Amino acid sequence: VLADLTVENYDRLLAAMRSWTGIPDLLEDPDHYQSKVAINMIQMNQTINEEW
Amino acid sequence: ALLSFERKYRVRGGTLIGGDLFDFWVGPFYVGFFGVTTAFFALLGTILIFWGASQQGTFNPWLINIAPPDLSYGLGMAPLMEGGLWQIITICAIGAFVSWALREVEICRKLGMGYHVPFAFSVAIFAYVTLVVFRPLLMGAWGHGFPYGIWSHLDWVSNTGYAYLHFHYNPAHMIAVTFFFTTTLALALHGALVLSAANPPKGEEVKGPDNEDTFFRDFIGYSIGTLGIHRVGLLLALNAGFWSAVCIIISGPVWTKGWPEWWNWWLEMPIWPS
Amino acid sequence: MTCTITCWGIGVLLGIMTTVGLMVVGWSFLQGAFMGVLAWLIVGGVLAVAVC
Amino acid sequence: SNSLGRNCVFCHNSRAFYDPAQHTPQWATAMLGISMVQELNNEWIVPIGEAHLPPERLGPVYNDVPKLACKTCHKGYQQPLQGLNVVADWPELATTEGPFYD
Amino acid sequence: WNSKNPTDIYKPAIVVGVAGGAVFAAALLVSWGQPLATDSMQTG
Amino acid sequence: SKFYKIWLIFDPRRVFVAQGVFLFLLAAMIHLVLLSTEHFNWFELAAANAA
Amino acid sequence: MSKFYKIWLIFDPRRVFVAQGVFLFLLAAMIHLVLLSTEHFNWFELAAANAA
Amino acid sequence: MSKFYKIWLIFDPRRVFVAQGVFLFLLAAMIHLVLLSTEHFNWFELAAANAA
Amino acid sequence: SKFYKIWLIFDPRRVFVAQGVFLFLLAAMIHLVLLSTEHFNWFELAAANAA
Amino acid sequence: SKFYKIWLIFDPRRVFVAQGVFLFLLAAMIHLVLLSTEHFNWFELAAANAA
Amino acid sequence: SKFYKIWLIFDPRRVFVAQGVFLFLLAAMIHLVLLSTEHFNWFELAAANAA
Amino acid sequence: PEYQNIFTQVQVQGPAELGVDNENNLTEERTTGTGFSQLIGWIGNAQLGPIYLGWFGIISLVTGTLWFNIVGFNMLSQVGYSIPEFIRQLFWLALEPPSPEYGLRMPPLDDGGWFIIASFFLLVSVISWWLRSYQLAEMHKMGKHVAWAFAAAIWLFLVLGLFRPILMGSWSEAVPYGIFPHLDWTTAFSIRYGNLYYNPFHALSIVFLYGSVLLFAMHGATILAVTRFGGDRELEQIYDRGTASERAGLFWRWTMGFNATMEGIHRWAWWFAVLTPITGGIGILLTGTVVDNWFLWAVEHNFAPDYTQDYGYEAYTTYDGFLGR
Amino acid sequence: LSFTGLTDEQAQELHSVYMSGLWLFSAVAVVAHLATFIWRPWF
Amino acid sequence: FTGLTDEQAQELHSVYMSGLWLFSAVAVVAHLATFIWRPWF
Amino acid sequence: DLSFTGLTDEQAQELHSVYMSGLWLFSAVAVVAHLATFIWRPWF
Amino acid sequence: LSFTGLTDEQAQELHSVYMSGLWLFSAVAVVAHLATFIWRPWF
């Protein structure tokens, strides 16, 4: 879901999401349940913006 | 005409600002200086209502609706067909009501009786005054007054009532309503007491104050007396009018949020073991 | 009256003091007012009965 | 009303709570919100909560996943962040594919 | 010389006091103006 | 002039109390009006010049 | 008219003097407040403009 | 100065004294609190600023 | 030194009751103030000192 | 020097009751507004001074 | 040493009723505030001890 | 100023007045203990009279307490016998009526079964109290106006909880026994069935409810205005009218063009009070059973106002303008 | 001297037993607080 | 007992004047002292 | 002489003596308590 | 002359006791005020 993003945009988005959710190490470890939910939350956020 | 005893009481004097110029009766009504202004203001307000009804397009008494201006107009005067007519009728209504109360002062001054009735009416005037000129000023717009319609002003009460999220939880409305119910309860019991004492079953002597005094002593264990009921009843009704003024004057300019959320002070106290 | 009116006046002064006394240590105006109103009923009635 | 920071007359007339002809345009928006909240909870929030959320995030009574609602996104205001344009700077979160920075 | 006549000394003072109070209150509400001011949004 | 006859109609003992309270409200009211305006907050003006 | 002195044969001098005394005051109170109400004729606010 | 004792013949000494007694305290308390309202003459916060 | 004459002005029964309930209300109010603060509230201090 | 004449017009029992309630309310109000300020708060100071 | 004559001004039946109400209300109030804190809530301590 | 007869400036107390009594012999069931209260004496009689311990009153008191207790213990069982929570939520707890999916059938105790038992005891207590009022008037050889005025309140009381639920097909239409809950029911009842503002009988009851308060402010002030002429002694003014009755009549004849007698005032007073629940009882009885939407009833009967202005805040202002930005 | 119609003969007697009740009420309160302090100390 | 007299007027004003001067004397000292501490002009 | 309560000076001598004794006894307990709590937790 | 039924002979005595109490009240008040200067000045 984030692989196609450019390096500058991925760093920009990752830094914001960590500050937006208050998790400093968000998406650092894929095994962590924080990363599992965040990936789905990213897809949810995109769904709300375009489908709703 | 005159009652069988009205001739003696019809004496000149007891006028506030008027003199013998307006000191006369028209039929049963007593005209005074404030009866002159009452007649002018009431007729002007009534005619303007029907003039607005003509321009509104309907003369149906249920559907007649003279409404205050938009909130965008603020406290300034609005165009006559855009809310300005409502402001003038309000000015006429205030003049008609105040003059009516002041005329009642002239009535009771001429009769040598107390000024309780004009004072009691002034409380009801204050309830109207706080609804049409006091609350709008505290909000900065004349558009918050109720429209002058038989059913339109019911929509305003409905919308204003739900504008504060279940108005039933308004503490002053809670106090005001229980005064309204108690006054009707007191009116029913007091009216029943006198009628029952004066109208016994056929073939029975009429009952004096002692018989009616002891009835509630045997009924509810305490009787407030012939004199007590009238003063407590007047205060019950005046409190109902006064607390009605409070419940609407604290709605917007005091508690803009929902009324159940006002009760959060009771739900959230340090004493309660959360 | 006189004594009873004065005793009631002491209660309402105490009720006002308790209204602002609890506001200082926290609470809120409405929460403090209820204690102040409650204090006025209790000590005002007790003083009007015992002192007078 | 509490979630929106508004009152009942913000969306429809009190005299007719049913009449579509007596509805504020905001009432139509609230219909979309009701559908969106139901869609978000039933297909997005709950499915991802029962799969990864730890027990400490579950409910106190039914041990259920937390769900979102009107106040979750509005936080007591008429519009989230008082209508602050937040997605303009983030085309990545605007569409599911092809961010379209343009 | 002293004049000893029945008068009502405080009768006019209270009359102008409340009349002055209305002028007093209006001046405060004009100079400062609406302490707990509120605004309404017309939704109908 | 001939203004000394105002006491021939008005009661001097009744007017001082009405007058006395009347000047009190003026002094109290005008003093508060000055405080409302930022140019005449002599309490706040003592801070601007001493800043 | 030079014959206006006869108004005191109709109006009580004591009652009319107190009548205008209050009336003359509300004049001064009302019109001054109307001046303060307007931004243009508010000398207090004008002094601030000349200060800056 | 000392010849103005004739005014006292009009007032009841109890009434004027209690009226002026509460007037001075109310005026003094009002002047004190407006001094507390301003940010320059509030001696409570001045000590806080002085003591840092 | 001559304060004993206050009882010639105050009724003993009426004033003893007045200060009898004044002391308890004052003592309760001062005690309740200590509950409000955190440093002098012996209930949380006992819990904190008990680890 | 002639201040003792104040009792010739004031009832000693009436003024003393008024004096007693006024002094306590004044003392309580001064104490209360003192606690409102952060600087002159001995309860908060002790907590800060201790730690 | 001479406190026996307090009853010379206080009616026994009038103060005994007030004292009896006051003592129970005070005892209940102290018990209630003691149950408010979690350190002295003997009902919860019993539950935690048996857990 | 002139003495307004709001609070008595001096009150006297003598031997306690027990009652009048007759060959109906009310003394045996009448209490022998009375008390006096000066605080209530500033506005009314200072004597706390003796209860008449009739069997209708005793049954009403016993069964009324049974209804009060049953509702109370269910409320106490709502929060699991937690008294601090019971006190905190006292205005919020209630004994809810049965669920609508039970109809007139007896529901389980936890789902309105105790509501029916409490309602049955409340019905007995309320009816027994009315029989007490009827019997007391009969034993005093007085008119039954108190009983009939009370019966009007019973009409709305019976319609709200008994008559309407029976012919609505479910016990769920009854009013919950709660402080705030019966306020919630009052609002939800109006919302469910359109708008009770547009119910003509609700409007009619409001007309008499305002009129009842209006009259009793009129009557209360008028009697207090003529109390300087012995106007508080209304009964003696009925049999032999004095200047109190004449001045009170001429005050309203000169004001609004017509007046009443000292006895005819209470007939006016009685009927608006009695008509307030009678009209309301009719309106509730035919709400839902006959008319299921009152605003739509108003629309087809052409007394619902129509508004030609827009219904959106965007038509009068803007979000940025409202916030001041 | 007297406000409740009591003399020194019995008012002294009344206080004698009232203090006895006060001491007994305090004595059982002292041991009650001593027992509570041992169980759950608050100092 | 209602009303005053000339004889009591001289002494009543004199003691009232003495109280007013004493009150004003403290007031001017308080006002003067506050000016050095924090002038308002 | 002057007495608003109908109580002689001799009676007030005894009444104030016991009250002063009660004043000191109440204060002495408070003084001991105040010193004890100051040692436990000083506030100034 | 007297306006509250209190004789002038003992009126001076009433003020003498009152002022002694007022000075005693102000004496401890000054000492208390002096103590709070050292503890925490506000000037």
Ligand code: BCL
């Ligand atoms: C959704 C609606 C909310 C609600 C919202 C409001 C709102 C909003 C208001 C009230 C107000 C009131 N509510 Mg509520 N209220 C609700 C439910 C209730 C219920 C109930 C059983 O459910 C009750 C009993 C009440 C009761 C009341 C009273 C306390 C009060 C009515 C006005 C009044 O007192 O007179 C006051 C009015 C006057 C006395 C009029 C004065 C009349 C003048 C002086 C004379 C008229 C002369 C005229 C020209 C006629 C002459 C013509 C012919 C010649 C005779 N509310 C519902 C839940 N309620 C109203 C109020 O308080 O107003 C102050 C108010 O604004």
Ligand code: BCL
């Ligand atoms: C959003 C709320 C709805 C609303 C919903 C209702 C409902 C629902 C009802 C009313 C009804 C009433 N409404 Mg409405 N009403 C609203 C808005 C208003 C407004 C207003 C200004 O807005 C007003 C003034 C009113 C006014 C009124 C009264 C005219 C009327 C009740 C009269 C009454 O007391 O009967 C008197 C009778 C009773 C209150 C019960 C009698 C009690 C028994 C007899 C006594 C038993 C005592 C008991 C055992 C306790 C004893 C304890 C003692 C201490 C011992 N409504 C809005 C539209 N309104 C009633 C009605 O319709 O009447 C036709 C009703 O049922």
Ligand SMILES: CC[C@H]1c2cc3[nH]c4c(c3C)C(=O)[C@H](C(=O)OC)c4c3nc(cc4[nH]c(cc(n2)[C@@H]1C)c(C(C)=O)c4C)[C@@H](C)[C@@H]3CCC(=O)OC/C=C(\C)CCC[C@H](C)CCC[C@H](C)CCCC(C)C
């Ligand atoms: C205020 C406290 C309570 C009360 C008391 C009360 N009312 C009183 C009195 C008293 C003591 C009188 O003495 C006086 C009287 O004489 O009654 C017969 C009166 C009165 N209160 C009345 C009505 C009334 N009272 C009400 C309620 C109450 N009465 C309160 C509960 C209500 C409500 C809330 O429903 C109403 C409608 C009148 C019967 C009478 C006032 C008569 C009067 O003012 O006459 C002069 C005016 C006219 C003849 C017409 C004026 C017309 C206007 C110029 C234009 C229209 C203005 C109006 C606002 C339009 C309304 C449009 C729609 C909303 C309908």
Ligand SMILES: CC[C@H]1c2cc3[nH]c4c(c3C)C(=O)[C@H](C(=O)OC)c4c3nc(cc4[nH]c(cc(n2)[C@@H]1C)c(C(C)=O)c4C)[C@@H](C)[C@@H]3CCC(=O)OC/C=C(\C)CCC[C@H](C)CCC[C@H](C)CCCC(C)C
């Ligand atoms: C004409 C319509 C008006 C009206 C009239 C009216 N009401 C009436 C009457 C009349 C004419 C009476 O004669 C009758 C009466 O006696 O009034 C004093 C009454 C009455 N209407 C009442 C209330 C009432 N009236 C209302 C309204 C109205 N009634 C209308 C405004 C309302 C509303 C709608 O708000 C209410 C709530 C009562 C005061 C009384 C009816 C009481 C009665 O006779 O029987 C009811 C039940 C009991 C007395 C038993 C109650 C149970 C206990 C007493 C309570 C708990 C006690 C304690 C806590 C026990 C604890 C036990 C445990 C410790 C074990």
Ligand SMILES: COC1=C(OC)C(=O)C(C/C=C(/C)CC/C=C(\C)CC/C=C(/C)CC/C=C(\C)CC/C=C(/C)CC/C=C(\C)CC/C=C(\C)CC/C=C(\C)CC/C=C(\C)CCC=C(C)C)=C(C)C1=O
């Ligand atoms: C025991 O004691 C008591 C009594 O019993 C001794 C009583 O009774 C009463 C009164 C109470 C009663 C119940 C008696 C009966 C009354 C009622 C049922 C009404 C009260 C109850 C209600 C619910 C209110 C209903 C309202 C009604 C009936 C309307 C009355 C009010 C009005 C405002 C309308 C009447 C007023 C009019 C028409 C205008 C007044 C007239 C003037 C000011 C005259 C001005 C004239 C001029 C300036 C000259 C110009 C002349 C012209 C144009 C000519 C036109 C002529 C005309 C006549 C219009 C009480 C309280 C009482 O306690």
Ligand SMILES: COC(C)(C)C(=O)/C=C/C(C)=C/C=C/C(C)=C/C=C/C(C)=C/C=C/C=C(C)/C=C/C=C(\C)CC/C=C(\C)CCC=C(C)C
């Ligand atoms: C920020 O803006 C603000 C500031 C708000 C503002 O603009 C408003 C300001 C405003 C309105 C200022 C208006 C101030 C005015 C008008 C000043 C009042 C002050 C006055 C008038 C001084 C009285 C002094 C009286 C005493 C102190 C007597 C002493 C009495 C003594 C102690 C009694 C002695 C005893 C006796 C006499 C015994 C008598 C008995 C017998 C003889 C038997």
Ligand SMILES: COC(C)(C)C(=O)/C=C/C(C)=C/C=C/C(C)=C/C=C/C(C)=C/C=C/C=C(C)/C=C/C=C(\C)CC/C=C(\C)CCC=C(C)C
């Ligand atoms: C909010 O703050 C927190 C910190 C929470 C708080 O807790 C605040 C606590 C505060 C303020 C403590 C307030 C408590 C105080 C002040 C304690 C008063 C209590 C006292 C003093 C106890 C008297 C007991 C005396 C008895 C009970 C005698 C019994 C008498 C017996 C029964 C004999 C009676 C019989 C006779 C006399 C017969 C005589 C007859 C003849 C001779 C005929």
Ligand SMILES: COC(C)(C)C(=O)/C=C/C(C)=C/C=C/C(C)=C/C=C/C(C)=C/C=C/C=C(C)/C=C/C=C(\C)CC/C=C(\C)CCC=C(C)C
């Ligand atoms: C925000 O506020 C914060 C900062 C929180 C705050 O704390 C504010 C605190 C503030 C304002 C302090 C206010 C307290 C003050 C001023 C202290 C007054 C208290 C006093 C003075 C103590 C009286 C004690 C009376 C007794 C205890 C007598 C004992 C009497 C005994 C029992 C003798 C009785 C005997 C007889 C009657 C027999 C004789 C009879 C005959 C001879 C007949």
Ligand SMILES: COC(C)(C)C(=O)/C=C/C(C)=C/C=C/C(C)=C/C=C/C(C)=C/C=C/C=C(C)/C=C/C=C(\C)CC/C=C(\C)CCC=C(C)C
């Ligand atoms: C916002 O405001 C903020 C900024 C917070 C503020 O600070 C506002 C503060 C402001 C405005 C200060 C206002 C304070 C003033 C004006 C001070 C008045 C206080 C006075 C005057 C002190 C009286 C003391 C009286 C006693 C204590 C007598 C002792 C009496 C003794 C004990 C017994 C006497 C008894 C007898 C004589 C009778 C026996 C004799 C006989 C029977 C012969």
Ligand SMILES: COC(C)(C)C(=O)/C=C/C(C)=C/C=C/C(C)=C/C=C/C(C)=C/C=C\C=C(C)\C=C\C=C(/C)CC/C=C(\C)CCC=C(C)C
């Ligand atoms: C220390 O206290 C303890 C002990 C804990 C305690 O108890 C405290 C008690 C506490 C707090 C309860 C307080 C009760 C409260 C707040 C409830 C208010 C009550 C209210 C608002 C009533 C509204 C609705 C009334 C209607 C409208 C009824 C309609 C009734 C109908 C007419 C009955 C009809 C009959 C039936 C349906 C039965 C049919 C069956 C048969 C005939 C067989």
Ligand SMILES: CCCCCCCCCCCCO[C@@H]1O[C@H](CO)[C@@H](O[C@H]2O[C@H](CO)[C@@H](O)[C@H](O)[C@H]2O)[C@H](O)[C@H]1O
């Ligand atoms: C229970 C009794 C209730 C009594 C109610 C009293 C209501 C008092 C209303 C006060 C509000 C009017 O006072 C207000 O003062 C402000 C402050 O400059 C002035 O001006 C203000 O309002 C006007 C509207 O006219 C705006 O255009 C303006 O931008 C704003 O500053 C006006 O003069 C007046 O609108």
Ligand SMILES: [Fe+3]
């Ligand atoms: Fe009557």
